[PDB]
């Protein structure tokens, strides 16, 4: 996260670290949506242009973390993956359309002060909250700059959702309805973005109607990190929820 701050303890109890076994590496963020299911970006697991094709045994998920590098004894829980599910129309060839994947855990993780699932939006929640100007929150252990470049602890930044024509006009990439963009404009003064290693993490919003946190996006892509006139692009969780629901219903 560029131009963010240190998370508070227990601020983002659905935050998951995708951790490579060998070499020991932060791969991506992810999020806890139930005791057995983790949500992430497809490109965290499959990205042929960079020879990325992670199997279940290549990774661990670390849940309840705050420190990036420490083993947080008595706090974090570490789960092995039972199965990876990538959206079958995930478009790695062009624009990362439908950049979403599910991971079923081997065993249920126990909830705690530090470990708790986020809600997924329904149509009404999406319609209410996904509006230009409305701010969501992005968290992660990714780099602090495009290029100390790496954070000691989990980072947080609040960013406004951006008007769809402004998103389109910032890039040559073909945008789809399965994406939205967020971030401040040059004239707004405030800054912030996701960066390398924040991929797959959640963009969340707090419903003012029921005081619950909803994951509206997944950190997908951008052009650099925190560049003026560029924006971060997020997978539109609600648009792909029918797929989410179908995978969970048949495999869960």
């Amino acid at each position: 996260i560029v131009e963010g701050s240190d998370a508070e303890i227990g601020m983002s109890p659905w935050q998951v670290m995708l951790f490579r076994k060998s070499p020991q590496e932060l791969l991506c963020g992810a999020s806890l949506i139930s005791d057995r299911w983790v949500l992430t970006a497809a490109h965290c697991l499959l990205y042929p242009p960079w020879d990325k094709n992670f199997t279940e045994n290549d990774l661990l998920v670390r849940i309840g973390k705050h420190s990036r590098t420490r083993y947080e004894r008595n706090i974090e829980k570490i789960s092995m993956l039972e199965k990876i599910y990538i959206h079958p129309r995930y478009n790695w060839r062009e624009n990362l359309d439908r950049d979403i994947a599910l991971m079923k855990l081997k065993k249920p993780v126990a909830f705690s002060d530090y470990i708790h699932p986020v809600c997924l939006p329904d149509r009404e929640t999406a319609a209410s909250l996904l509006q230009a100007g409305y701010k969501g929150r992005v968290t992660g252990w990714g780099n602090l700059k495009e290029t100390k470049g790496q954070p000691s602890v989990l980072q947080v930044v609040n960013l406004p959702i951006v008007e769809r024509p402004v998103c389109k006009d910032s890039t040559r990439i073909r945008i789809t309805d399965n994406m939205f963009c967020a971030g401040y404009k040059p004239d707004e003064g405030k800054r912030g973005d996701a960066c390398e290693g924040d991929s797959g993490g959640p963009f969340v919003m707090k419903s003012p109607f029921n005081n619950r946190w909803y994951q509206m996006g997944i950190v997908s892509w951008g052009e650099g990190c925190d560049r003026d006139g560029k924006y971060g692009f997020y997978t539109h969780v609600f648009r792909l929820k029918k797929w989410i629901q179908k995978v969970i219903d048949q495999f869960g």
Partner: peptide, 6 residues
């Protein structure tokens, strides 16, 4: 162009 993942 092609989108560049974070």
């Amino acid at each position: 162009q092609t989108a560049v993942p974070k």
